[PDB]
Write an enzyme that holds these catalytic residues in place. Sequence first.
Site, PDB file in Angstrom:
ATOM      1  N   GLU A 183      11.598   8.527  -6.965  1.00 13.88           N
ATOM      2  CA  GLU A 183      10.938   9.495  -7.835  1.00 13.88           C
ATOM      3  C   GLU A 183      11.390   9.309  -9.279  1.00 13.88           C
ATOM      4  O   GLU A 183      10.873   9.956 -10.190  1.00 13.88           O
ATOM      5  CB  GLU A 183      11.231  10.926  -7.375  1.00 13.88           C
TER       6      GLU A 183
ATOM      7  N   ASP B 267       0.860  -1.173   0.000  1.00 13.12           N
ATOM      8  CA  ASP B 267       0.000   0.000   0.000  1.00 13.12           C
ATOM      9  C   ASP B 267       0.897   1.225   0.000  1.00 13.12           C
ATOM     10  O   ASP B 267       1.914   1.252   0.698  1.00 13.12           O
ATOM     11  CB  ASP B 267      -0.940   0.020   1.211  1.00 13.12           C
TER      12      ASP B 267
ATOM     13  N   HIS C  73       0.098  -0.064   5.204  1.00 10.26           N
ATOM     14  CA  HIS C  73      -0.367   1.318   5.220  1.00 10.26           C
ATOM     15  C   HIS C  73       0.157   2.061   6.436  1.00 10.26           C
ATOM     16  O   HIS C  73       0.553   3.225   6.333  1.00 10.26           O
ATOM     17  CB  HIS C  73      -1.892   1.371   5.195  1.00 10.26           C
TER      18      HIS C  73
ATOM     19  N   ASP D 257      -2.781  -2.232  -2.800  1.00  5.99           N
ATOM     20  CA  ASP D 257      -3.685  -1.157  -2.419  1.00  5.99           C
ATOM     21  C   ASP D 257      -3.114   0.168  -2.904  1.00  5.99           C
ATOM     22  O   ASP D 257      -1.994   0.236  -3.417  1.00  5.99           O
ATOM     23  CB  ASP D 257      -3.896  -1.130  -0.901  1.00  5.99           C
TER      24      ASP D 257
HETATM   25 MG   LIG Z   1      -7.531   2.112  -1.486  1.00  7.26          MG
END
Ligand SMILES: [Mg+2]
Length: 727
Positions: free
Chosen positions: A538, A504, A702, A570
């Site tokens: 990046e 995520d 996350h 995610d």
């Molecule tokens: Mg999501």
Amino acid sequence: QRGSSGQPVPVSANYLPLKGNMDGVFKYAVGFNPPVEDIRSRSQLLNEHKELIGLTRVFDGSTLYVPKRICEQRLDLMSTRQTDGASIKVTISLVDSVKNRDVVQLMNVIFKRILRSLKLQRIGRDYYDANSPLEVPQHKMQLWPGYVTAINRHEGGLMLVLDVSHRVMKTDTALDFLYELYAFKQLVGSVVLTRYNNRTYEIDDIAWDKNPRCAFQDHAGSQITFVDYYKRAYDLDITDLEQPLLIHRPMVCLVPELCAMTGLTDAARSDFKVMKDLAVHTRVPPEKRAESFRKFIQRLNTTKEASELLHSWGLVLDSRMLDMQGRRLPPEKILFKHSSIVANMEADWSRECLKEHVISAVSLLDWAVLFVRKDQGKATDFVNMLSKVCPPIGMEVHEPKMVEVVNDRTESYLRALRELIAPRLQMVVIVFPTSRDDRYSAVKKLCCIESPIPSQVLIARTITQQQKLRSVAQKVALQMNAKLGGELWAVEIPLKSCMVVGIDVYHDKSYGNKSIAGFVASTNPSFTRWYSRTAMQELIHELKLCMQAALKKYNEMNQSLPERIIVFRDGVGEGREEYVSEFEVPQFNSCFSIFGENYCPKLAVVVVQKRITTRIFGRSGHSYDNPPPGVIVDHTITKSYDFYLVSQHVRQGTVSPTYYRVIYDKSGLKPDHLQRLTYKLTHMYYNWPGTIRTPAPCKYAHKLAFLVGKSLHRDPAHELSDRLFFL
RNA sequence: UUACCAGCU
Ligand SMILES: [Mg+2]
Ligand SMILES: [Mg+2]
């Protein structure tokens, strides 16, 4: 390609099947040779000629849709009747009737026009009313009813999804908010709407350089001031002669004195009173949401313009939301060291966790506590309570090393921390008088990166005597035991020698758009210990090394290598799902394969989406209510190997299901054995005893991404990768 | 950071 093991449940979803009168529409392609010159001309001539021939339509430059064949299938007009007086060769060519792919855009345009017919304004990507507000008068607020409409092709058919939304707008004027400020970031996102014309414009810049006395161009360059124009048109004035202004680029100037902000600002987001006052209105139960749905669909089929347009296009839609048959997964057995507790319908065992011993506990031979002299009493009573409550839950704890930091500032905390921590020391706890993010960030930077010490931070307010002590001690002891590389509970996962991976990404605008990516992979058959890495660039090339390092850790621990590797992705939008399949999966497939010799793991890649407009309600008889946690919906709405799962329980309001999209399956797992697996992984969160929305590896990833982007800004030390230091 | 779910100008 469908699940099969689960008792069916009656459920329903906010969807409308649209009738299949699709084949009627015929397509005409238009051609203009000599001048061309853009739309003003294209609209005028097409208007006149095609209106004599026919009415209704959409014409975006070249293509043209009309329900009936034009009076001449091929017709050539030769007059521009423009100011120049030149000629234009209009060429009409009928092509097929309509492509199956191309109907969706047509009905999208038609339905957006239909909703504009109802007087509903379009703000954001949503359709809000402006004459029937629910009003909360305490803090100069109200709510505007809204409908989140989208015509898309789902597997069931051409479906309109409807969803009742609410959009907070402030009765107070932007001038008053500016006075409160006396904020470039806050206003640009908000779509500020004008009050006099009740029209809405997204704002781009907040400029105080310009002045109201500057007069905008109008009537062919004549300069007219804002106040005079507003008085002439809408009958109001601006009180302040000199004032800041807002700028939106289509040169559009907005006056703060007549501008009311929509949305809720960061100060309003933090203030608990605003949230609790709004929640009763904005958070709607399922029965009231159903009633609003039926009121909206009754309103649509009664107004004159909307009723006429649908019959003009020859489409008639159903009168009620869709009904469907989800399946409820059996409740899972949560396994503690000396006892097993089966979770109730609410799927919460927080009370039971207090009274049972943790699976494997890191005995706290020694741990430290930092505190300020003001809260020394707080620290002592908290430590006493913590020592009291620990033995019930299986942990064995000894009295700490107590250090009184010289000053509340973070620098003194760091100066004490460097000397305190030792290889022997297992954990440091910290007392904080005030909740400030910078001090937390510095503490976590030292604990996660610079030195390998798991740590916990406690602000004084939550531990201010009363019954706070028992609850806080019992909810901190488990977090400490989870941070020390110990597991609290377990569930039985059939999968053997499997390495679930959760990715995520947390997009942070502040830190140079680094797009911090998490990576959390299990390193146990029982899925209780994890290996954590984070990729930043990046993402493309850091995921390589993260995956190889995780494979190496699993090999080191289990003296083998996994046969299956399950990847839950995610933080990817609906549009960019194909991008992941194109660019990420083959890179993974080659990258871990090349290292080692003749090693080919399976790579099941499943994409997880939280923000969706789909709602699943349940009923038993006639009343609509929330479904119990653990219901799967796999057919009649899902397209190309997907499913929906409800796992969260909400005290107030409706549940928002979770979407699961299998983008690449080569693992040989059944769809059912993946559905049950991702349901079981939902209980594996050690901060909340009970279920969560997203699968546990993705939630850990996350949190790791949020901790790295918001706080650490770098790579946590490799020493703490095995431990869930980020919990 | 005790912890889960929200033409306009
Ligand atoms: Mg999501
Ligand atoms: Mg924590």
